[PDB]
């Protein structure tokens, strides 16, 4: 632990590239959150929405 | 567009609907339309 001042330099770009990634499931009010399946089952409509 | 049609199919003209009209007899695009008019004809078709 003597090079902290690299470490978390590292460490938090690799959190932001992980919080990044993880967004991908959130809902944000939606249906559902993967698009394939939403658009799989939904009229153009309301898919669209 | 002019045509006669049952009473109840009325319901299918519109965008965004199925049944048979929308499928296989006149289908909407999804745009903006002038207007939809439409009035009885029992005294000049049945």
């Given at each position: 632990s003597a090079l902290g001042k690299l470490q978390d330099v590292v460490n938090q770009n690799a959190q932001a590239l992980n919080t990044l990634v993880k967004?991908?499931?959130?809902?944000?009010?939606?249906?559902?959150?993967?698009l394939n399946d939403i658009l799989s089952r939904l009229d153009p409509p309301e898919a669209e929405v | 567009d002019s045509f006669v049609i049952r009473g109840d199919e009325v319901?299918?003209?519109?965008?965004?609907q199925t049944g048979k009209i929308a499928d296989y007899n006149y289908k909407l695009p999804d745009d903006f339309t002038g207007c939809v008019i439409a009035w009885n004809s029992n005294n000049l078709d049945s």
């Open positions: 967004q991908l499931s959130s809902n944000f009010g939606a249906i559902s959150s993967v | 319901r299918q003209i519109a965008p965004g």
